[PDB]
């Protein structure tokens, strides 16, 4: 056996403050894979060993080291998962999935976008606001569209929550002097709802 295992992955998106779960598929001409490693291409400048960042990106593979566990008909599944911290940066990470067969052939890491979705994958970390699309609330009637009272602002905030049960429980809903709504997600990103869908002049 001189053929390394092959990997089929994809483009993975995750969101701060949210959990994620993706599955990559691994095959080998022998039908058996003994190890799968998800890793940065470069070695940890300290231990001289492979590592994986971000530290919140985890992986696990069931049924390693068993005959017939990685056939083209029934590929081996590696789970990539985690909970994205609220405080991590938003950005892209390009990482590699490398598997080893009984002959100790291991998938090669090739730094080329033409390998994206195979053994190389791009993990996009977006802000939490990008997971949600706030819905307009039932309008609140106000005396003056240019100068909302405290109680009118409170009522708008409640109306926005009532119409958006899917929003993170810890999101903060604030309302400006003209009825503009800001939804501040736990990761501090924001969405806005324009006043003209939220408030109406009483008269
Ligand atoms: Ca092989
Ligand atoms: Ca949004």
Author numbering: 244 to 446
Task: Quote the study's own text.
The conserved sialic acid-recognition motif governs general specificity while sequence diversity in surrounding loop regions allows the SLBR to select between related sialoglycans.
To understand selectivity of these SLBRs for human glycans, we chose comparators from each branch for detailed study. Specifically, SLBRUB10712 bound strongly to 3’-sialyl-N-acetyllactosamine (3’sLn; Neu5Acα2-3Galβ1-4GlcNAcβ, Fig. 1b) and a small range of related structures, while SLBRSK678 bound to only two of the glycans on this array, 3’sLn and 6-O-sulfo-sialyl Lewis X (6S-sLeX; Neu5Acα2-3Galβ1-4(Fucα1-3)GlcNAc6Sβ, Fig. 1c). Consistent with our prior studies, parent SLBRHsa preferentially bound proteoglycan 4 (460 kD) from human plasma, while SLBRUB10712 bound GPIbα (150 kD).
